[model samples]
Target: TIQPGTGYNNGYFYSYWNDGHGGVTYTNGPGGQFSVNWSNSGDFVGGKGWQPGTKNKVINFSGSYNPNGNSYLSVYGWSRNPLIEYYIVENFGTYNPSTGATKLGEVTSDGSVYDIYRTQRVNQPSIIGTATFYQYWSVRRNHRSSGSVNTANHFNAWAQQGLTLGTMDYQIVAVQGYFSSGSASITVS
Candidate 1:
């Protein structure tokens, strides 16, 4: 488990992907540089964030993704039971809503306007067990460069406005993996 307040998960640090498919490697670099290489296996990879019993803390996430691969690169924060989270995918791939998906209105957070969306799935693989909840996604509809940035306070942001799912007692933030192919590395500092 990648615990909080350590290297990279603290004020500023880096943690490479621990879960993914195909040829995936994590290299811890000097001076806060962590690299992840994925060779077209699946759509999920990267490090896990776990901060136990902490709330109302602001999380600032900024990274550089190289070459723009076939996946949706994102930074997100979530909780398992009755999930309530937010993610910013540098809208580059085929994951954006195209008419069929429901648009749940717009919300502004961390100084960006996100087109909120509501969706559901049969047990998200990202989280354990077979429990489902209403996933309200505040997504940005555009492609961002390698050094694009976003920030969100996982606990305080959701708690104050009641924009949360379930109780939202415990939450985590993660740097998600590349989707399809090519060489891509995300540096979070």
Candidate 2:
């Protein structure tokens, strides 16, 4: 028995029409491809591979969650913020071509302060042949003394070890929180 496909790969498919140009009209364009529109926008509303990109909602926040092993997270469509805190705990240390030696500490963006604590690991895509520390991105709870809290100041960090991150077959696990009550989720390969 055979099953009909609803999509282009297998199921039944229908030709797309452009609303801007009235309908599908045969017209030569780049790559000898023809485009059509339904409306009067004079734009080819129909084309191949026009689908939107895949939603990169790797990790979500709700309560105490951890994407252990290897994985990363991204945030969007969220406005209200909470105590957003995260860390990249490395296992070992490696050489850094840019800085020479990188030890465990509070990995910051600019080369100045080093908050020593956890183990150190090398980040991927190093400048030279040597590797560096993984990127560190943490939104610490730096509450003000008197003024109101600035939720807009909420940001994320990625602390890399003195190694080639991504260069090795590793993962990026992310654990995020908003304020008092938040959740944590992960997205693995």
Candidate 3:
């Protein structure tokens, strides 16, 4: 499910995205960064300021199954003793209006580098991208695993508004792995 950029979903609303007056606010989404232009009275929830086809554009995305390989995974697996690792790859597509949905780009990540266990099914060996929220990019993999003894991860990244101008705002890269060795031994390393 793709959505337009807005303030933190923390249920709190504020002028963090853009201070208005032609200033800029970088709203991070499941795909990439969205630079929104606004005046002091601009609206973020839903207004004529920044729509899906206007100033908002997907800058980065993931097309392969892998981990954001971030810190949250470790917090989830801290008690289970599981080894986790992943890398970040750019130049991909997320939402495609032409196709009426989000479009994950080409498969560029090499899953063979990690010790991920394809345990969902021995007959169906599939790759999955982990759910992540690094700053502005939030994405969920093709498959999902969660349980008491299972480790689920949530990765995220972020940056402030005054960091850069035009294009050099901020970048994020991280992951969280859930581990439950007793009842859950699923791996996508």
- Judging by TM-score against the true structure, name the best candidate: 1
**Model 2 poorest 10 in a row by lDDT:** 76-85
Clashes of each: 4, 60, 27
> What TM-score, computed on C-alpha atoms, does each candidate reach?
0.63, 0.18, 0.16
- Residue-level lDDT of model 2, residues 1-189, one tens digit each, is 112111121221112222233222322223212222112223221111111112122221221232222212222111112111223221111211114333343433222232322223455322233444434222222211111111112122122333211222111222221111212222221
Q: How accurate is candidate 3 locally (lDDT)?
A: 0.20
Total clashing pairs in model 2: 60
Residues 1-189, candidate 1: write the lDDT tens digits: 332223443434333433335555555544434455556555544532333323444433345555335454555545655565455454444435323657656656555666656566656543444556555555665555344343343233434445554443323234344554444444443
Model 3 misplacement above 4 A:
1-101, 112-166, 175-189
After superposition, which runs of candidate 2 have C-alpha atoms over 4 Å from their true positions?
Answer: 1-60, 64-130, 142-189
The regions of model 1 sitting more than 4 angstroms off are: 1-20, 30-32, 48-57, 67-69, 84-86, 97-99, 145-163, 166-179
C-alpha lDDT of all candidate models, in order = 0.46, 0.23, 0.20
As for TM-score, the candidate ahead, 1 or 3, is 1
Clashing pairs in 1: 8-13, 8-14, 17-46, 40-180
- What's the true lDDT of residue 109 in model 3? 21
lDDT of 2 at 125: 24
